[PDB]
Design an enzyme around this catalytic site. Sequence first.
Site, PDB file in Angstrom:
ATOM      1  N   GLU A  35       0.837  -1.200   0.000  1.00 28.42           N
ATOM      2  CA  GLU A  35       0.000   0.000   0.000  1.00 28.42           C
ATOM      3  C   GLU A  35       0.875   1.254   0.000  1.00 28.42           C
ATOM      4  OE1 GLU A  35      -3.047   0.303  -0.617  1.00 28.42           O
ATOM      5  OE2 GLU A  35      -4.021  -1.586  -0.155  1.00 28.42           O
ATOM      6  N   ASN A  46      -7.790   8.807  -5.689  1.00 32.92           N
ATOM      7  CA  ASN A  46      -8.593   7.769  -6.325  1.00 32.92           C
ATOM      8  C   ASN A  46      -9.503   8.440  -7.354  1.00 32.92           C
ATOM      9  OD1 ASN A  46      -7.366   6.164  -4.298  1.00 32.92           O
ATOM     10  ND2 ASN A  46      -9.248   5.056  -3.877  1.00 32.92           N
ATOM     11  N   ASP A  48     -12.717   8.368  -7.726  1.00 37.89           N
ATOM     12  CA  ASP A  48     -13.993   8.873  -7.267  1.00 37.89           C
ATOM     13  C   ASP A  48     -13.826  10.218  -6.567  1.00 37.89           C
ATOM     14  OD1 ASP A  48     -12.891   8.083  -4.815  1.00 37.89           O
ATOM     15  OD2 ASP A  48     -14.622   6.771  -4.274  1.00 37.89           O
ATOM     16  N   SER A  50     -11.877  10.653  -3.859  1.00 36.57           N
ATOM     17  CA  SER A  50     -11.271  10.406  -2.569  1.00 36.57           C
ATOM     18  C   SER A  50      -9.759  10.309  -2.721  1.00 36.57           C
ATOM     19  CB  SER A  50     -11.859   9.155  -1.953  1.00 36.57           C
ATOM     20  OG  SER A  50     -11.430   8.014  -2.681  1.00 36.57           O
ATOM     21  N   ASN A  59      -8.931   5.430   3.193  1.00 38.48           N
ATOM     22  CA  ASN A  59      -9.649   6.242   2.251  1.00 38.48           C
ATOM     23  C   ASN A  59     -10.496   7.319   2.903  1.00 38.48           C
ATOM     24  OD1 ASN A  59     -12.335   6.349   0.231  1.00 38.48           O
ATOM     25  ND2 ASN A  59     -10.348   6.209  -0.831  1.00 38.48           N
TER      26      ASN A  59
END
Length: 129
Positions: A35, A46, A48, A50, A59
């Site tokens: 990660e 991200n 979307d 976020s 997130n």
Amino acid sequence: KVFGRCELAAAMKRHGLDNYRGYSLGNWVCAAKFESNFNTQATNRNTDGSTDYGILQINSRWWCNDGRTPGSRNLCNIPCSALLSSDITASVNCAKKIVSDGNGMNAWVAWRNRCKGTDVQAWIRGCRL
């Protein structure tokens, strides 16, 4: 902070993540490796709108508040910036909530694609824990 592998293993164990929700310490170390590369300061946007924050890429749509995410629920009740500290406490506490939410560690994309089903014990090999 960029943790060493055993350094992070030790911290995660102290904070109660080894076998949390049945996930061995090696699972959590492998998740952090893929990660964030063990870097508390890591952030990644991200699609979307976020962003993922910290050593476990938590997130901003569900878990932490960053002030710019549509639909944000802040279920960990924390600023996303807290998840970038050299002190992993906030990331751990929030990760415990996330892994309890129903789908286990599958929440972590990089865990599912790179750790799940592999020899995760290797991630704590050599460590004095």
